[PDB]
A paper describes a structure:
The outer surface of the head is decorated with the highly antigenic outer capsid protein Hoc and the small outer capsid protein Soc. The 376-residue Hoc is a monomeric fiber consisting of a string of four domains connected by flexible short linkers, of which the three N-terminal domains have an immunoglobulin (Ig)-like fold. The Hoc subunits bind near the centers of gp23* capsomers, one per hexon, and have only a marginal effect on the capsid stability. Each T4-Hoc fiber attaches randomly to the center of gp23* hexameric capsomers in one of the six possible orientations, though at the vertex-proximal hexamers that deviate from 6-fold symmetry, Hoc binds in two preferred orientations related by 180° rotation.
However, fitting of the Hoc C-terminal domain (residues 281–376) from the AlphaFold model into the cryo-EM maps at the vertex-proximal gp23* capsomers of the isometric and prolate capsids showed only two preferred orientations for the bound Hoc molecules. These two preferred orientations, which gave major contributions to the observed cryo-EM density, are related by 180° rotation around the hexamer axis. The Hoc chains fitted into the density corresponding to the two preferred orientations showed significant overlap, indicating that only one chain can bind to the center of the gp23* hexamer. The 3.4 Å-resolution five-fold-symmetric reconstruction of the native prolate T4 capsid (EMDB-32109) also shows similar preferred orientations to the Hoc C-terminal domains attached to the vertex-proximal gp23* hexamers. Similar fitting and refinement procedures were performed for the Hoc C-terminal domain attached in the two preferred orientations to the gp23* hexamer adjacent to the “top” pentameric vertex of the prolate capsid located on the five-fold symmetry axis. The occupancy values for the two orientations of Hoc were 0.42 and 0.35, which are close to those in the isometric head. The Hoc C-terminal domain, in both the preferred orientations, interacts with six gp23* subunits with an interface area of ~1200 Å2. However, at the gp23* hexamers proximal to the capsid vertices, which deviate from the six-fold symmetry, Hoc binds in two preferred orientations, which are related by 180° rotation, in part because the other orientations involve clashes and, most likely, less stable interactions.
Residue numbers in the entry:
A (entry chain E): 66 to 116
B (entry chain Y): 281 to 376
C (entry chain F): 117 to 521
D (entry chain A): 117 to 268
E (entry chain A), G (entry chain B): 320 to 369
F (entry chain E): 320 to 420
The structure:
Amino acid sequence: AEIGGDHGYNATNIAAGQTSGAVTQIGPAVMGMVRRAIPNLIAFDICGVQP
Amino acid sequence: AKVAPEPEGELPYVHPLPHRSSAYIWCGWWVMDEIQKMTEEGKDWKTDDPDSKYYLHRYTLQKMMKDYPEVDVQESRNGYIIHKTALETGIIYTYP
Amino acid sequence: MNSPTGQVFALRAVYGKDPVAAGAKEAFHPMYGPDAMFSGQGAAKKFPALAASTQTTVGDIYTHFFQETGTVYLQASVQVTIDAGATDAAKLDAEIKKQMEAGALVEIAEGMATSIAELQEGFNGSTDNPWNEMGFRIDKQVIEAKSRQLKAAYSIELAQDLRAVHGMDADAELSGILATEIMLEINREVVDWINYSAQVGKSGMTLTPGSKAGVFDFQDPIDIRGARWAGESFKALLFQIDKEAVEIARQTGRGEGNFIIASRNVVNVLASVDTGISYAAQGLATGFSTDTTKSVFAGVLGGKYRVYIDQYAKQDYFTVGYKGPNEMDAGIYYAPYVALTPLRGSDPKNFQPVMGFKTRYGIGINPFAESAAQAPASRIQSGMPSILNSLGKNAYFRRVYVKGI
Amino acid sequence: MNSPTGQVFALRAVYGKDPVAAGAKEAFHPMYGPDAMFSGQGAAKKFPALAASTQTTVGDIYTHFFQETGTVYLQASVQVTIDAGATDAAKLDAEIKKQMEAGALVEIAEGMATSIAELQEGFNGSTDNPWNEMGFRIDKQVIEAKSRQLKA
Amino acid sequence: GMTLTPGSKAGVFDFQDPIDIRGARWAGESFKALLFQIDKEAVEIARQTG
Amino acid sequence: GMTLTPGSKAGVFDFQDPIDIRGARWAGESFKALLFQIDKEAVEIARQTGRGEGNFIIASRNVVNVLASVDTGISYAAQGLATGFSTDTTKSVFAGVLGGK
Amino acid sequence: GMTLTPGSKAGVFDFQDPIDIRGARWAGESFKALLFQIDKEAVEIARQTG
């Protein structure tokens, strides 16, 4: 019975396409990349500059 | 009759007023309600309940009336300055 | 999802030549400030750490790392001892903060001398002075779909009797009921995660020092800041909401809290106070849909937060959360894959029909959710929520219980 | 009414395989929350009823039904006892509320694995994994027309 | 039940009880306290009927 | 120094101490007391530097939040959801212009 | 009768009795008590006369 099965919910087996069934997956799709936001400065309208 | 046990330091500031032998401190409505709660089951507010959640403002007031004969303590519900013998009873204006 | 098992990458910048090393510090961080002497003098000398009962010389610089607020370098203004009675890390932080406020230790950042700078990495026959390089990591989290299903199992006799007496189809209704409950149940799951993964509000930086560490009470004058009468007490709740949302902005590093989920009592309190900056007011509920029958979304609070009513709230609460304009900058992902697939059949032994439904959705967490971990483990992590990585850790939500309404 | 003694019918959406049974719950009850894991994990395993004297286990999940606000499933994050002194329902509900506020017992709801729900109710030679079911009950309420009169 | 502020008298609204009027003063605020109590009851009606 | 109130805490402005908040009741006025403290600090800057009143505030999130939740002008007692200032350290550190000054 | 607050003086509205003035403060709020009292008397005339 092509009980296709399902992953073990283990992160590696989800990524690897490893499933407990007869069909082995391609890959874990993709949803985009989350980067750490770059913090904003305070500039120097608070202190001198004098290059 | 008895002395209220001393609860460490950090006593709220009492302003000396030698102009009339009086003194001013802002207590708030919670104390003026709590002390109003105190004098309804026969209890005492000068020295009873040493482990109170609001004992500190109660202890300072007791010494303040001894130091000053006509203390001027102001609440916040109406902001009135009840005097020492006006503070004696614990019933301020109304209510059970 | 177009196929089960979605995945999402996450790029982190960390410094020290080693993107992947035990205890590398993430460079850009919503909470942790930069090692402001990492590129400067910290690339010339290594400063002794601050520890419990560490006697202080005057003029030396000591590093430290509060659990919040990141790295900091403190110069000593007066010789002191750190009171190793604060052996615990959180107590160490409390001691160091007390000393800093006392002015004994004050933070400083500096650059490196030119005579040291120009020789970096053995120019002019020096040695042992490498540069303070940086790098980036890139890991990924993966999210696999679960399923959810139900059955009806009625009989044809019931169908005939129902269509005859009441005219109800006796099949569609069942399917309706089935689908309804399933969808309803799915919704509940999501909400519970929001409450489940919520951080404890009213605590840490949002905690007024005189309050009860996580619960906002309308009887405590410390919480209502001495307000009398309802017209002024409720604006204290407004201020509490503001504190929680601001702290979310701090920990998340994406934005202020922009939605609020709260019970009927809290929402009705909100709808009956003049939300904007005003003197004091209280009356009938006008600005919000306080009944959970026309809709659950009750309104917009002051143009900032969308307010939703949890009609099944157990005691009383509000939870402030952030949901960015982008779909990824979310905190929690409800990612449907198959929607309410129906199935029909009958029992061959008695011809009596059976109705059923099944769906596969799954649900995942935003990476960076903990917001206090510079770098994850194993680089391929389980995006699905659990106790190890979501229970009171997801900084995107903060939950506070309200008593005394 | 164009006839005396009218009657009305009430349709109650009740889950639990037997619409007319003791202890059956109404599915869309306004006071009572949905059985959030009825169609999810609750169809794969049965969560222990959280009653007096229980010793909670970190990570484990319990079930309860409050007299108000309805059903709930509680994952325990700290090993606590539930104050066996509680006997009646109100006392137990209040104690569970105290524990929930304490953060040692947080509500939860989860979906069910595909590798399970694929085999539900005896597929592929499996056994002892019935689906969860729901039907409706429909009961009857009747009134009679009393009268009233006067003379001049 | 849900409509009780923990210190009240469970079914009677007393204009002399601070918990019932949320601590209001004079007639300007006490009446608004009555309005809020009415709002609370309507909310509970929405809750129980659905 | 001369910014002290005689009964204050000498270096920390405490919202719970009635001496510092000038006897204010409730929140819409205990906040105004903070604005008054800011003004006194700036005037002492003008005294000590000899160049004029201080014109900028570097403050943590909570201070800015309480600043943005009151009517900063001379306009009775008022309080509500913070709207006049940007408390997001995500959008910009620069909170805004308090009182136009 | 119906015009009586259970704490009042039964036929005299007293500006010194806190039950009568609804706990008002200064003359701004203490007179509005007499306003409300006149409203109650008008209502009772409506009830008795019909």
